[PDB]
Design a protein around this nucleic acid. Structure first.
Ligand SMILES: [Mg+2]
Lengths: 122, 120, 132, 101, 195, 161, 63, 99
RNA sequence: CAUGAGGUGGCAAGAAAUGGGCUACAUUUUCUACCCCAGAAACGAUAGCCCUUAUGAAACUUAAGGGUCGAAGGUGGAUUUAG
C-alpha cells in the first residue's frame, strides 16, 4: 500500500513567558537542521487577555486590581515531509514536550483523484 | 490454571531487569498503559460504534409511516434537517428520536385525524 | 493598607523564607508560578478541574506530611505526567520517606490516572533567607 | 459530609435538569412553530405544566464550588472572585499575573 | 536517622557524557548537579539565593536532557524511519498539478487523561478546481451552485465539513459531496432554457 | 515522474529501540528504581534491600487500602479508559450458583470453603482448575483433597494422576 | 572567609569544566560569553527582572 | 431573482441539506437547536459542582485510620471535649423543652 | 422532640425629602448615500397605549422593531469639583 505524503504543516508552540519559548524554538530549529528539512520560523503578533476584578468585596469601588494573561506565538513553517517523516518528527517533539505549552497539528495530505469522481454512480 | 500462573511468575522472575535510567521508567509507563499513545490521535476510543456517514447525514431511510404533503411532512423535513447537521449526536440518538416521534404520533391518533390531515 | 499575602515588617524574629517573602505584584518579575498547565492560555478550557486537582493535591501533601515539608511544591502538568517535585527535611528515617513516597505515587497513579515520580532535595530545614 | 444546603439544592436541581431535559426540549420544539395544529401545542403545554418544578433550567443558579456565591463568579474557573484572586497573588496559577502594563 | 553520602560531585570525571546522566526530562536536582547556578533577588551587602532549596530553578523548565550530542545521536538514529521525497514534488507547480486535493488534519493536545476534542473532528478540503474537466456550462453551473465559498481569484474550494465525530467519515462525506457536485455536469434537468 | 514509496506502520517497539536503546549508560551511575538525592542514594547493599522492601510494602498496603473500599473507584473520567483503573474484587457476584461460586471463591479459608460449599449444595467436581489447584495449594491435606476430588466422580484420569 | 571563597572558586571551575565537556568544546576556549549563552539555553528563565537571571561568573562579582 | 435562481437555490438547499419548501423566521430556531447540543446537557453545566461526597468520605476514612492528619478536626474535637467537661455537652433526645 | 430542614403563594406599593448616570434646552442643532466643496425642514429622548420578535412552562418592567397622540423643555441667581 502506498504511503501518504504531506504538503505543509503549522505546529506552533505558545508559552506564557519568552525564554522557554525561545529555547524550545531553538531546540526545534536545531533538530530540523540536523536532519536536512530546512524549515522557516517567524514571530506572529502576540495577544494579551485582560480582565478587571475587585480588590476588596465591600464599599471600595475606587480600587481595582486588574490582571493580564501574557502569551506568545512562534509557528514553524515546515515543507516537504512525507507521512512517516512527519510522524517521527511529531513523536520526537512530543517526547520533549514541556508542561505549559499547546500544540495543534494541521497536516495536509496529497492525493490525485479518488475512485468515484470521474464517472461514478449515484 | 494455577500451573500457568506459576509458570508466568517464574518467567517474570527469571526475566527481570532493574531500572537504570529514566528511559526504562518511560518504557514501563508506556507499556503499562498510563500515558496516551504518543501518535496522539482523536480516534482512540471514539469510533462512534463504527457507523458510517450515510446513516448520519442521509435520513431518507427513516421516512416510511409519514405522508408526503401537509404540515406533518414539513415537520419531518425540519427535524431531518436539524438532525443531519448535528455533529454532537450519532445514528442511535436519531433513531431514538424518530421512534419517540412515531410513538407520540401513534399515541395521539384522534389529534392527527382531527388536525385536517390523514396520518398515512 | 492593602494587607496582602506579603510578610509584615515588625520585629526581627520571624524566620521568613524566600517564596512568599516578596510582594504579590513581583510574581512576573522577582518570583514565579507554582503551577503550570495549558489551561492558562487563550483558547483552552477545563481550568476549573485543573485548579480543583491542584488544590486537592496541595491539601493531601500538606496533610500526609505534618511538618516534613519546608515551603510549598512546584507543579509540572506535562499533559499526562504529573511531578510533585519538592524538598525533604533531615529529621526522620529514610525508610519512612521511601514508604510515604511509594504510597503517594501508587495513590496518584491509581486514582488520578497519571504516573508520578518525585525528586527529593536534601536540605537541613526551612530555606530561610531573612531573620526579620 | 456537607455543611451548606444551598449548594446541595443547586447541584440537585442541576442533576434533575440533566436527567429530565429531552422531554422539555421536545416540548419547546413543538411549541414554537409557524402553523401547526393547535391541539398539539395544547397537549404539549399540558404535559410540560403537569410536571413539577425542581427540574427547569431557569431554576439553575450558577454559584461557586467552594463558597457558593451567586454573584461575581467567572465562568472560566467557576469560583468566587476572592479565593481565585488570593491563589493568583500567592503565585500558583501561571499567566494570571497582576496588570503592570 | 542521619547519614552523609557523597553525591555526583565527586563521581563525575572529566569526560562524562551528559545525556548518560539525565536521559529523561529531569527537573534539575541541585543535590546531584554540581553546577553552581545562582539567581534571584540579591541585596546590597550579600549574595543571592544559591542552588540549595532554590524553588525558582525548579519552576524553570530546564532542558539539560536536550544535549547537542544527544540531539545528533537521535537524528542519526532516526534516519532509517525517514522515507524519501521525490524530486518531482519539489516544485509547487508539479506538486499541485499531480496532487490538487488537500485534506487538513486536526490534532490538538490536552492537560488531562482525556484526549477528546469536538473541535478536532473538522477537515478543511482545499481542492484547486483548475486541474479537472471544467468547461463553460459546467463551470457556470458549479459557480452558481456554490455561491461565495469558491474563490474566483485563487480558484480554491473551501468547504467546512464537520457533521460527524470522525475524520475519515468527514473525508468520505466530502468526497460524496464533490461527487454530487460533479454529477450536475453530466445530469441536467429542464430548467436551463430559462437561464 | 513521482515515485510513491510504501508505508511503514510501526508501534512502540520500533521507537523504543530507536531512541531508548541507543544512549549509553553513565560510568558511575545509580539504579533509577530508587532515588537520586544523597540522603536516599543506594550506597551499600543493605540500604538498597531496605529501600526495595519498603517500596514493596508501600505498594502492597496501597493495593490493600484501594481494594478495601470498592465504592471509591467506580467513577471513570478518561474516555479511552486506562486498564489500570479497574479494582480487583474478592467477593462472589452470584451466590445462587454452586460450582461457579466455588470456582470464583477458590481461583477466579479458600479451597476448603469451596469444597464445603460444593458438598453442601451438591456440585460436581471438574478436572480443570480444581484438582490441580487443590494439589498445588491445598503435604497431607492437599493430597487428601486431591484424592477426594478424584474419587468424587469419574473425571479425567491424566489430570487426576 | 577565604575558605568559602576558595570553595566557591573550585565549584565554579568544576562547573565550567562540566559545561565545556557537555557542550563539546575545549575548556580553554570556553569563554564567559559562551558560558552565559549555554546557561541561558539550558535554563530559560522567563522573567522581567534582570537580576533574577541564572548566572555563573567568578565569585568576585557574586560576593 | 427569477425561476433559474430559485431552482439553483433549491438545488443548493437540497445538496447542503436544508428544506425545499420555504419556511419562516419562527420555524428556524427549532432547526438550529436540533442542529446543536442543548445547554442543559453539554460539557460544563451538569458537572458544575464536583462530587464532594466521595472526597469527604475519603477524608473521613483517612482521619479515622490516622492518615490525613487534619488539625481542624482535631481542634474541633478538642473544643467539643472542653465544652463537655465545662458543663455544656451535646443535647440528647429528651432534654430541653419537654424535660 | 428547635432559633433546624422540605413543599404552594405573596414581597420591587406610594403622602413625601435626598445623591449619581444619560438626554436635550435651535441655526454650535435635525435628516438624506459618500463623514462635512451638497441640499432641505424657520429642533429629541422617556410616560402611558396596540401589534409583533431572541430565550424563558405562562412579560406584573430591566431587551428590541413598527404606529395617530407624545408631558416641564427655550442655556440654571444662595454653594462647589477636575484638567
Ligand atoms: Mg491601594
Amino acid at each position: 500500500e502506498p504511503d501518504i505524503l504531506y504538503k505543509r504543516l503549522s505546529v506552533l508552540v505558545k508559552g506564557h513567558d519568552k525564554a522557554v519559548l525561545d529555547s524550545y524554538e531553538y531546540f526545534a530549529v536545531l533538530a530540523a537542521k540536523e536532519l536536512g528539512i530546512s524549515i522557516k520560523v517567524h514571530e506572529p503578533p502576540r495577544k494579551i487577555e485582560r480582565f478587571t476584578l475587585l480588590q476588596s468585596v465591600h464599599i471600595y469601588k475606587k480600587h481595582r486590581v486588574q490582571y493580564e494573561m501574557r502569551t506568545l506565538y512562534r509557528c514553524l513553517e515546515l515543507e516537504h515531509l512525507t507521512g512517516s517523516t512527519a510522524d517521527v518528527y511529531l513523536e520526537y517533539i512530543q517526547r520533549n514536550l514541556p508542561e505549559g505549552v499547546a500544540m495543534e497539528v494541521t497536516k495536509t495530505q496529497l492525493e490525485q483523484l479518488p475512485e468515484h469522481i470521474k464517472e461514478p454512480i449515484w | 490454571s494455577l500451573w500457568d500462573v506459576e509458570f508466568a511468575k517464574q518467567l517474570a522472575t527469571v526475566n527481570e531487569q532493574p531500572l537504570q535510567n529514566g528511559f526504562e521508567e518511560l518504557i514501563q509507563w508506556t507499556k503499562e498503559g498510563k500515558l496516551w499513545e504518543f501518535p496522539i490521535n482523536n480516534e482512540a476510543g471514539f469510533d462512534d460504534d463504527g457507523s458510517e456517514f450515510h446513516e448520519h447525514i442521509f435520513l431518507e431511510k427513516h421516512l416510511e409511516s409519514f405522508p408526503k404533503q401537509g404540515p406533518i411532512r414539513h415537520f419531518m423535513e425540519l427535524v431531518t434537517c436539524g438532525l443531519s447537521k448535528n455533529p454532537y449526536l450519532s445514528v442511535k440518538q436519531k433513531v431514538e428520536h424518530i421512534e419517540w416521534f412515531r410513538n407520540y404520533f401513534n399515541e395521539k391518533k384522534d389529534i392527527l385525524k382531527e388536525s385536517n390531515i390523514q396520518f398515512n | 493598607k492593602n494587607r496582602a499575602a506579603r510578610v509584615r515588617v515588625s520585629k526581627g524574629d520571624k524566620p521568613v523564607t524566600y517564596e512568599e517573602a516578596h510582594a504579590p505584584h513581583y510574581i512576573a518579575h522577582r518570583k514565579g508560578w507554582l503551577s503550570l498547565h495549558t489551561g492558562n492560555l487563550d483558547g483552552e478550557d477545563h481550568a476549573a478541574e485543573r485548579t480543583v486537582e491542584d488544590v486537592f493535591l496541595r491539601k493531601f501533601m500538606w496533610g500526609t506530611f505534618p511538618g516534613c515539608l519546608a515551603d510549598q511544591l512546584v507543579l509540572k502538568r506535562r499533559g499526562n505526567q504529573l511531578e510533585i517535585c519538592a524538598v525533604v527535611l533531615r529529621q526522620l528515617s529514610p525508610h519512612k520517606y521511601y514508604f510515604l513516597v511509594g504510597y503517594s505515587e501508587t495513590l496518584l497513579s491509581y486514582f488520578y490516572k497519571c504516573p508520578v515520580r518525585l525528586h527529593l532535595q536534601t536540605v537541613p530545614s526551612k530555606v530561610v533567607y531573612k531573620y526579620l | 459530609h456537607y455543611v451548606d444546603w444551598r449548594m446541595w439544592r443547586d447541584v440537585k436541581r442541576r442533576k434533575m435538569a440533566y436527567e429530565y431535559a429531552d422531554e422539555r426540549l421536545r416540548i419547546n420544539s413543538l411549541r414554537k412553530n409557524t402553523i401547526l395544529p393547535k391541539i398539539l401545542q395544547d397537549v404539549a403545554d399540558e404535559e410540560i405544566a403537569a410536571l413539577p418544578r425542581d427540574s427547569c433550567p431557569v431554576r439553575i443558579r450558577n454559584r461557586c464550588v467552594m463558597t457558593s456565591r451567586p454573584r461575581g463568579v467567572k465562568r472560566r474557573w467557576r469560583l468566587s472572585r476572592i479565593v481565585f484572586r488570593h491563589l493568583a497573588d500567592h503565585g500558583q496559577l501561571s499567566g494570571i499575573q497582576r496588570a503592570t502594563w | 536517622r542521619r547519614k552523609a553520602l557523597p553525591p555526583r560531585t565527586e563521581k563525575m570525571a572529566v569526560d562524562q557524557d551528559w545525556p548518560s546522566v539525565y536521559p529523561v526530562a529531569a527537573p534539575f536536582k541541585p543535590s546531584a548537579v554540581p553546577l553552581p547556578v545562582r539567581m534571584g533577588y540579591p541585596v546590597k551587602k550579600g549574595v543571592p539565593m544559591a542552588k540549595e532549596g532554590n524553588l525558582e530553578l525548579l519552576k524553570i523548565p530546564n532542558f539539560l536532557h536536550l544535549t547537542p550530542v544527544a540531539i545528533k545521536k537521535h537524528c542519526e538514529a532516526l534516519k532509517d524511519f525517514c522515507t524519501e521525497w521525490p524530486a518531482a514534488l519539489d516544485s509547487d507547480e508539479k506538486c499541485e498539478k499531480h496532487f490538487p486535493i488537500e485534506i487538513d488534519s486536526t490534532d490538538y493536545v490536552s492537560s488531562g487523561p482525556s484526549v477528546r476534542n469536538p473541535r478536532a473532528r473538522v477537515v478543511v478540503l482545499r481542492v484547486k478546481l483548475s486541474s479537472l474537466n471544467l468547461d463553460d456550462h459546467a463551470k457556470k453551473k458549479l459557480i452558481k451552485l456554490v455561491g461565495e465559498r469558491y474563490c474566483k481569484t485563487t480558484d480554491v474550494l473551501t468547504i467546512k465539513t464537520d457533521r460527524c465525530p470522525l475524520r475519515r467519515q468527514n473525508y468520505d462525506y466530502a468526497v460524496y459531496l464533490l461527487t454530487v457536485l460533479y454529477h450536475e455536469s453530466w445530469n441536467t434537468e429542464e430548467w436551463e432554457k430559462s437561464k | 515522474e513521482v515515485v510513491i514509496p510504501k508505508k511503514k506502520t510501526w508501534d512502540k517497539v520500533a521507537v523504543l529501540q530507536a531512541l531508548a536503546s541507543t544512549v549509553n549508560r553513565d560510568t558511575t551511575a545509580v539504579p533509577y528504581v530508587f532515588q537520586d538525592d544523597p540522603y536516599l542514594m543506594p550506597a551499600s547493599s543493605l540500604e538498597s534491600r531496605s529501600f526495595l522492601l519498603a517500596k514493596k510494602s508501600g505498594e502492597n498496603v496501597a493495593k490493600f487500602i484501594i481494594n478495601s473500599y470498592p465504592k471509591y473507584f467506580q467513577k471513570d473520567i478518561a474516555e479511552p479508559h486506562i486498564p489500570c483503573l479497574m479494582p480487583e474484587y474478592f467477593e462472589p457476584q452470584i451466590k445462587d450458583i454452586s460450582e461457579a461460586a466455588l470456582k470464583e471463591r477458590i481461583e477466579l479459608e479458600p479451597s476448603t470453603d469451596y469444597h464445603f460449599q460444593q458438598t453442601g449444595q451438591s456440585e460436581a467436581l471438574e478436572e480443570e482448575n480444581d484438582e490441580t489447584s487443590r494439589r498445588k495449594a491445598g503435604t497431607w491435606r492437599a493430597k487428601n483433597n486431591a484424592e477426594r476430588i478424584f474419587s468424587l466422580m469419574p473425571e479425567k484420569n491424566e489430570h487426576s494422576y | 572567609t577565604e575558605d568559602f571563597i576558595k570553595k566557591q572558586i573550585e565549584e565554579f571551575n568544576i562547573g565550567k569544566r562540566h559545561l565545556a565537556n557537555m557542550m563539546g568544546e575545549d575548556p580553554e576556549t570556553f569563554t564567559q560569553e559562551d558560558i552565559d549563552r549555554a546557561i541561558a539555553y539550558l535554563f530559560p528563565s522567563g522573567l522581567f527582572e534582570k537580576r533574577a537571571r541564572p548566572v555563573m561568573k567568578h565569585p568576585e562579582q557574586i560576593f | 431573482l427569477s425561476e433559474y435562481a430559485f431552482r439553483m437555490s433549491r438545488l443548493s438547499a437540497r445538496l447542503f441539506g436544508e428544506v425545499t419548501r420555504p419556511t419562516n423566521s419562527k420555524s428556524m430556531k427549532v432547526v438550529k437547536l436540533f442542529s446543536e447540543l442543548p445547554l442543559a446537557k453539554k460539557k460544563e453545566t451538569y458537572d458544575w459542582y464536583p462530587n464532594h461526597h466521595t472526597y469527604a468520605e475519603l477524608m473521613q476514612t483517612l482521619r479515622f485510620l490516622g492518615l490525613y492528619r487534619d488539625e481542624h478536626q482535631d481542634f474541633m474535637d478538642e473544643q467539643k471535649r472542653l465544652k463537655k467537661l465545662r458543663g455544656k455537652e451535646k443535647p440528647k433526645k429528651g432534654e430541653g423543652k419537654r424535660a
